[PDB]
Amino acid sequence: EIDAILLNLNKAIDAHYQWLVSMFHSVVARDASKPEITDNHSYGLCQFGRWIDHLGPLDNDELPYVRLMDSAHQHMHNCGRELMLAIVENHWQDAHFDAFQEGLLSFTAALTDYKIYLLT
Amino acid sequence: TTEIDAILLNLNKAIDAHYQWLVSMFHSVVARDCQFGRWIDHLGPLDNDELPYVRLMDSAHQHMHNCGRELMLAIVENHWQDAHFDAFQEGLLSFTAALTDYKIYLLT
Ligand SMILES: [Zn+2]
Ligand SMILES: [Zn+2]
């Protein structure tokens, strides 16, 4: 079980690199991007968000770790959506990029903290 | 164990640092304006067991940066193609794969 969970965390790192390349690609090509980027609830559509929504009965020890990564994942997707809307509508600012980078680093931090807990 | 934990910390820092690098590239294009590579050189003389792992991540890191540079030059000069983005994504995934394989070796 522990090795199963850890595999899914490492897949989330690769999948979110590809998500970011996809956003950069769609601005340069002037595309309509994809639901995983633009949907108001895009965090439900990627592989990681689906794993999260179906976990099931969690015990009291692991709960706080899972709640933190769920919340940080959602916030990262929300900042991504807002960045893309601002770029497309010609109202972007440096602050949109800073907020997105911070959201991104909070997500990787939340994943790492759960990793450490499981390994002990 | 202390040495092993030191190495593993440096590998997780590389993941965050290369996310920030990808954000900066995206930002500079829209505005129309590294630590890991220094660490690879500073590993000192290596034994024969670890050598192949280190050589693979060094090579994959270099090719990722080269694809990034070529993507940016093509965008700026207006002859970019979908293939430039695909080559960069593939370089990026080869790098993270090489890091993971070294991680697994150290843990055993
Ligand atoms: Zn996601
Ligand atoms: Zn680098």
Curated annotation (Swiss-Prot), chain A:
State any GO CC term: cell pole
What are its GO biological-process terms? Answer: cell adhesion involved in single-species biofilm formation; negative regulation of bacterial-type flagellum assembly; negative regulation of bacterial-type flagellum-dependent cell motility; positive regulation of single-species biofilm formation on inanimate substrate
Q: Assembly state and interactors?
A: Homodimer.
Metal-binding: is it a keyword of this entry?
A: yes
Q: Which residues form the signal peptide?
A: none
Which gene name does the record give?
dgcZ
The record's domain comment reads: Contains an N-terminal CZB (chemoreceptor zinc binding) domain and a C-terminal GGDEF domain.
Keyword Disulfide bond recorded: no
Q: What is the effect of changing residue 73 to L?
A: Displays constitutively high biofilm and PgaD levels
Quote the protein name from its UniProt record.
Diguanylate cyclase DgcZ
Q: Tell me what organism the protein belongs to.
A: Escherichia coli (strain K12)
List all disulphide bridges recorded for this chain.
none
Detail which positions bind Zn(2+).
Answer: 16, 46, 73, 77
The terms under GO molecular function for this entry are: diguanylate cyclase activity; GTP binding; identical protein binding; protein homodimerization activity; zinc ion binding
Question: Covered range within the whole protein?
Answer: 7 to 126 of 296
Q: Out of the domains of life, which is the source?
A: Bacteria
Q: What happens when the gene is disrupted?
A: A slight increase in motility. No visible effect on curli production. Decreased biofilm formation, very little associated poly-GlcNAc production, and a complete loss of aminoglycoside-mediated induction of biofilm formation.
